Amino acid sequence: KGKHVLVVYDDLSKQAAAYRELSLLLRRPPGREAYPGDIFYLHSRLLERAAKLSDAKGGGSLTALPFVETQAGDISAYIPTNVISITDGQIFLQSDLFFSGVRPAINAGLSVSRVGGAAQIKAMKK
Amino acid sequence: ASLRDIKTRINATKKTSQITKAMEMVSTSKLNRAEQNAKSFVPYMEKIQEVVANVA
Amino acid sequence: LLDAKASEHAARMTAMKNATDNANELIRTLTLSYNRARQAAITQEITEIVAGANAL
């Protein structure tokens, strides 16, 4: 309708756990870490629906902020890698920074944002 | 933790051991050269302290 | 000052010796942990494959 929406998903890790439960109970063949073969298909289908519509379509937009929880900083698990590969950028929060008084604990080094520079007013760009 | 954390810590320890060993090997020559430099002034000090001890 | 430099070099040499020894002890302990970590990882890999194969 031409509006702008901000969608926040709180635990795609928990969603994937539920889908793994369903897949295993239906006796579908499992992949690595017992995950179903189409968990990446599921997440890609979910996340590729955020967009910036052209002014022909009304100019509306929908931005998504998925969350992924990692166990003791292992960013190399199956779901973390799947979600990392899909999104345009990532923001990393670390307990080492969090408890050292640095909060919010964005690790500015690891974090990336590919769109960045076209999403910043000129004053902030300078 | 993970193999990532363990191997990262091992690599950091390895690099630090390399640096420390290099510093030690540097320091050995400095010790020897300092000793052989200190050997040089000994007769001069003995001469001057002989004269001052005579006049003392 | 010459004996001061000699003492400084000797202190550096001994301190680097101690640092190297401590680093090598850390390395042996961390490798001893690495062994059990990678062993558990291998067991997880094999078990995860074989238990999925067994039921289907």
Q: Is the omega angle on the peptide bond into residue A104 within 30 degrees of 0, that is, cis?
A: yes
Question: Is residue A75 helix, strand or coil?
Answer: coil
A35, A20 Cβ separation under 8 angstroms = yes
Task: Tell me how far apart the alpha carbons of residues B33 and C8 are, in angstroms, rounded to a whole number.
Answer: 13
- Contact indicator for A19, A42 with CB cutoff of 8 Å: yes
Nearest CB among B1, B2, B17 relative to C27 is that of: B17
Amino acid of residue C45? E
Which method resolved this structure?
cryo-EM
Distance from C-alpha of A48 to C-alpha of A86, rounded to nearest angstrom:
8
CA A125 to chain centre: 25
Write out residues 1-40 of B within 8 Å (CB-CB) of C. Answer: 1-3, 6-7, 9-10, 13-14, 16-17, 20-21, 23-24, 27-28, 30-31, 34-35, 37-38
A103 annotated as a binding-site residue: yes
Pairing of strands A4-9, A61-66: parallel
* Residue A11 labelled as part of a binding site: no
The dihedrals phi and psi of A30, each to the nearest 5 degrees, come to -95, 155
Residue C51: CB partners within 8 Å, gap ≥ 6? none
C-alpha distances out from residue B3 to A93, B9, C42, Å? 21, 10, 12
Residues near A49 by beta carbon (within 8 Å), at least 6 away in sequence: A62
**Helix/strand/coil for C6:** helix
